[PDB]
C-alpha cells in the first residue's frame with residue numbers, strides 16, 4: 141500500500157480522491173476531526189482516531205476539537221461540565237496513541253470574525269438544508285430548538301475559520317461536509333468512516349444507547365458484551381462482531397477452537413474470514429471467542445495507560 | 451391626561467399596564483425601538499417616533515437601534531450599504547424632533563458575552579416558535595434561511611444585553627416580545643403601536659410595497675397619493691385616510707368645503723369625525739382634501755429640515 145491506499149483503507153467514501161491526491165503532495169497539510177465530549181469512549185471513537193493516526197503517519201498535522209459548544213448546543217449539559225469531560229476524552233485519545241493538538245471549539249467560536257461569518261453563512265443556508273444535515277446528529281427532541289440549525293453552520297464555519305485541508309468523521313457528517321464544500325471558497329477534502337453497528341444489531345453504536353464497547357472496558361466486560369451480541373450465522377451485514385474483526389483485528393488471524401469442532405483455524409485476511417462465515421464454516425461462538433480475546437489484547441495498552449493514572 | 455394616558459394614547463396594547471405604572475415611578479427609565487434601515491421613511495416610522503417622543507416627554511431615556519445586522523439577516527443587502535442608509539434614517543428621525551441615542555446593533559452584537567447568550571437562547575427557543583414570531587417580519591422567501599430564526603433571538607438578546615425597561619414597536623413585534631418576556635429574567639414592558647394600512651387598502655404600509663406616504667414627500671405627491679387612496683364612504687375599518695386623521699391630525703379639525711356641499715365643517719375630535727363618516731355625512735373627497743392639506747402642514751417642518759441640507 142502507498143500512502144493514499146493507507147488513508148483509504150476501511151473508509152466509506154473520500155470526497156474526493158483526486159483532491160486528496162493534491163493534498164498529499166504538500167509539505168504541510170492538516171486534518172481535523174471534532175468530538176462532542178462523551179462520558180464513555182467506545183470503538184466508534186477508536187475507529188476515527190485510528191484513521192487520524194493514519195493521516196499523521198502520512199505527514200498530516202492532526203487537530204482535534206473538543207467540541208464543547210457543539211455538545212452544549214446539542215443538549216449535552218452545561219459548559220463547565222462538558223469541558224472537564226472533554227479533558228477526559230483527550231487523555232483517552234492520547235492513551236490510544238494519538239499525539240495531536242487538542243483544542244476546545246469555544247477557543248475560537250466567540251471571536252468577532254468567526255461570529256460575523258456565522259451570520260453570513262446563515263444567510264446562505266436554508267432551514268430545510270440545515271435540518272436535513274442534522275437528522276443523524278441532533279439529539280432526540282419532540283420540540284426541536286434553534287440550536288439544532290445553528291449547529292451545522294458552526295461546524296462549517298470552523299472548517300473555514302481554521303483552514304484545515306481534510307475533514308474526517310463518520311458518514312453521519314457527510315451532509316454537513318457537503319454544505320461546507322458548497323458554501324466555502326476553499327473546498328475541504330472529506331474522509332468519511334463507516335458507522336459501527338450496535339451490539340444488539342439495532343441501530344448504530346452510541347454512547348447514549350448502551351450498545352457499545354468502551355476502550356477501557358474490563359476483559360470480562362468485553363467477553364460478556366460480545367457473548368450477548370447480535371451475530372447471526374452466515375449474516376455479515378449488520379453484524380457488529382464481523383465489523384470488529386474487519387476494522388480492528390490484525391491478520392493473519394488464528395481462531396482457536398477445540399479439535400472436535402475443526403481445530404484451530406488460521407485466516408490470512410478479513411475477506412477470507414467473511415467467506416468462512418457466509419457459508420456456515422465458522423460458528424458464531426468461535427467467532428465471538430476469537431474476536432473477544434483479540435480485542436482485549438488490542439485495548440489492553442489503552443486500558444493499562446488509563447489504569448496507571450489511579 | 452396624566453403621563454400614563456399620554457403614553458397609552460393611540461397604542462394597540464401595553465404589556466402590561468400595571469408593569470408600566472411601576473416603570474413610571476423610577477427616576478431613570480429607558481425605552482428602546484429598532485428600525486431596519488429603510489430607503490424611505492413613511493408615516494409608519496413617524497407613528498412610532500411620535501410614541502418615542504411621548505415616552506421622552508414622560509422622563510424616559512430613548513435609545514434607537516439602527517438595526518444593521520437585523521437588516522443584513524433579513525436580506526436588505528450588504529452591511530456597509532445598510533449602515534449608510536441607517537445614518538440617513540437618523541437624520542430623518544432627528545428632523546422629526548427626536549433627540550435620542552442612535553446606536554447600531556453591530557456595536558454590541560459581536561461581543562463574546564452577547565454571542566454566548568445567543569447560543570443559550572437558541573437552546574430555549576424552538577424552531578416552530580421562532581418561525582411563528584417572524585411571519586409578519588421575515589422578507590418573502592420561498593426557501594427560508596437559518597438567518598430567519600437567528601433574527602428573533604438577536605432581538606431578544608439585545609433587550610437583555612442592553613437592559614431597556616420598555617420596548618416599543620408595531621403589533622408585528624408582539625410575538626418576539628412575548629418570547630423575550632418568557633425567556634429573560636427581567637420582563638420588559640411592551641408598548642405596541644397599530645400597523646398602518648396601505649394607501650390601496652391591501653395590506654399594511656410598507657417601504658417595499660409602494661403604498662406609503664414618505665415624511666419628505668412633496669405636497670403635490672401627498673395630494674396625488676391621497677387622491678388615489680382607498681377611502682370607501684362610511685367604511686372606517688381598513689381606511690388609511692381615516693387612520694391618518696386619527697393618528698396624526700390635531701383637533702379641533704376644520705374641514706373646508708364649498709357652501710354648496712354643506713360649508714366648512716369643524717370637528718372637535720376623531721370620534722366626532724368617525725361618526726360623521728360612518729353615516730355618510732362627510733364625503734371621502736372632502737375628507738381627502740382636509741387630510742392631505744393638514745398632513746402637508748404636519749410634515750412641512752420635517753421636509754424643510756431635510757431640504758435645508760441640500
Ligand SMILES: N[C@@H](Cc1ccc(NC(=O)[C@H]2CC/C=C/CCC2)cc1)C(=O)O
Nearest residue numbers: 172173174203204205207277298299302
Ligand atoms: N457533528 C459531530 C461533532 C463535530 C465534528 C467536527 C467538529 N469540528 C471540526 O470540524 C474541526 C475539527 C478539528 C479541526 C479544527 C479546525 C476546524 C474543524 C466539531 C464537532 C458529531 O455529531 O459528532
Ligand SMILES: N[C@@H](Cc1ccc(NC(=O)[C@H]2CC/C=C/CCC2)cc1)C(=O)O
Nearest residue numbers: 482483484513514515517587608609612
Ligand atoms: N424586528 C423589527 C426591527 C427591530 C426592532 C427592535 C430592535 N432593537 C431593540 O429591541 C433594541 C432597540 C433600541 C434599544 C436598544 C437596547 C435594546 C433593544 C431591532 C430591530 C422590524 O421588523 O422592524
